[PDB]
């Protein structure tokens, strides 16, 4: 059970931050009760995961904000860059690899490829 | 004779597949017949067993009809109501003799939205096959 | 020694913390017959080199 990430979606940043503060103090209270009942020990589990959900939502909203803030620059923060391996980031582009000198290109546009059949 | 070459015919691999199967496969592996009446009504030959189905047993030393109280998927067996090990006391609790789902025909089905829908899905696919053939 | 660094203290503390037996409800839950944790140790015959 417990709070749903959809029901935290579309809520203001300060409502979210106060709800996180409440959950933190609640886990302190509950941990104190543990060190000093079925409903209480179920609530402890549900509340750990409620904290996790609030923090998930806060991070997702902030990330979308920042990725709009940097959308059209020349230098993007490395966190928002494409997901690619080291090798792929270092490879040449297909256009760069298919670039041809002028004289070679001219002689390649002269006599292009042709479909033909040969009989017996 | 098999023709498909991504499917093993190796006893070691088949037995290891039967054990260590995941839960969805195990649930599908625990199927049983529908009776003739339900075969006529739903036009379906087999269903995965469930709590709330009434089952008529044969071929065993514990023969009778009862409702499915529990499903022991690790063992691939089902605990039916009324079908027990013979107890020692006159008072002591019942203890279920576990029945294997292929030793039964389901007599009356538990129904809900998902059961209805998956049955209709299966009918339409069998109809595609029957139109092809 | 009575004069020990925190790093050696912490690794010794973990050995002490994990030197325990299998819980009985764990034995019942997991359906075990082996009930001795053979990674236990005793200070008299051990040579912890931490």
């Amino acid at each position: 059970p417990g709070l749903k990430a959809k029901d935290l979606v579309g809520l203001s940043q300060e409502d979210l931050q106060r709800k996180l503060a409440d959950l933190k103090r609640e886990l302190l209270s509950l941990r104190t009760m543990k060190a000093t009942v079925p409903e209480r020990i179920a609530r402890f589990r549900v509340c750990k995961k409620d904290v996790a959900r609030v923090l998930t939502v806060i991070n997702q909203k902030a990330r979308d904000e920042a990725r709009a803030a940097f959308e059209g620059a020349e230098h993007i923060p490395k966190t928002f860059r494409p997901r690619l391996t080291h090798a792929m980031r270092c490879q040449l582009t297909e256009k760069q690899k298919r670039l041809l000198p002028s004289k070679l290109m001219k002689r390649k546009l002269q006599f292009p490829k042709l479909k033909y059949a040969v009989k017996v | 004779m098999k023709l498909n070459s991504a499917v093993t015919a190796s006893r070691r691999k088949c037995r290891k597949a039967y054990f260590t199967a995941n839960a969805e496969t195990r649930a599908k592996m625990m199927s049983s017949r529908l009776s003739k009446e339900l075969r006529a009504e739903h036009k379906i030959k087999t269903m995965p067993i469930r709590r709330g189905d009434i089952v008529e047993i044969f071929t065993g030393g514990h023969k009778g009809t009862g409702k499915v109280v529990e499903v022991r998927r690790r063992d691939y067996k089902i605990c039916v109501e009324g079908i027990n090990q013979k107890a020692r006391n006159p008072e002591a609790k019942p203890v279920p003799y576990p029945i294997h789902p292929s030793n039964c025909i389901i007599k009356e089905l538990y129904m809900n939205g998902s059961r209805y829908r998956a049955i209709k899905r299966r009918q339409e696919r069998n109809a595609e096959r029957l139109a092809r053939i | 020694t009575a004069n020990k660094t925190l790093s050696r203290k912490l690794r010794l503390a973990k050995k002490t913390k994990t030197n325990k037996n299998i819980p009985r409800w764990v034995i019942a839950k997991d359906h075990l017959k082996k009930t001795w944790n053979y990674k236990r140790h005793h200070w008299r015959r051990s040579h912890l080199k931490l």
Binding site: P82, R83, L84, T85, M88, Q91, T93, E94 | - | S7, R8, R11, K49, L50
Partner: protein
């Protein structure tokens, strides 16, 4: 008295825990590890002991990043992303 009596004069630690490989192999006076070779930048590896090689190598740990990257390549969207980049 070169045996049992001489064994009673041992109250020193020659080696301690290594910061890189974690073994009781870091020599506390030479300041250099006899198992992995720390503080060398490269790891100590020898072909005359393949059992020593198999004891600590790629795969005896978690392989967390490489595991995710391989599954993403083999079945996820990574090569499509490569095509979009390399356009």
């Amino acid at each position: 008295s070169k045996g049992t009596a001489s064994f009673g004069k041992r109250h020193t630690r020659i080696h301690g825990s290594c910061r890189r490989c974690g073994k009781h192999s870091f020599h506390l006076q030479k300041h250099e590890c006899a198992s992995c070779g720390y503080p060398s930048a490269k790891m100590r590896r020898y072909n005359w002991s393949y059992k020593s090689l198999r004891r600590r190598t790629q795969g005896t740990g978690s392989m967390s990043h490489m595991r995710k990257v391989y599954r993403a390549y083999n079945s996820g969207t990574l090569k499509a992303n490569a095509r979009k980049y390399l356009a």
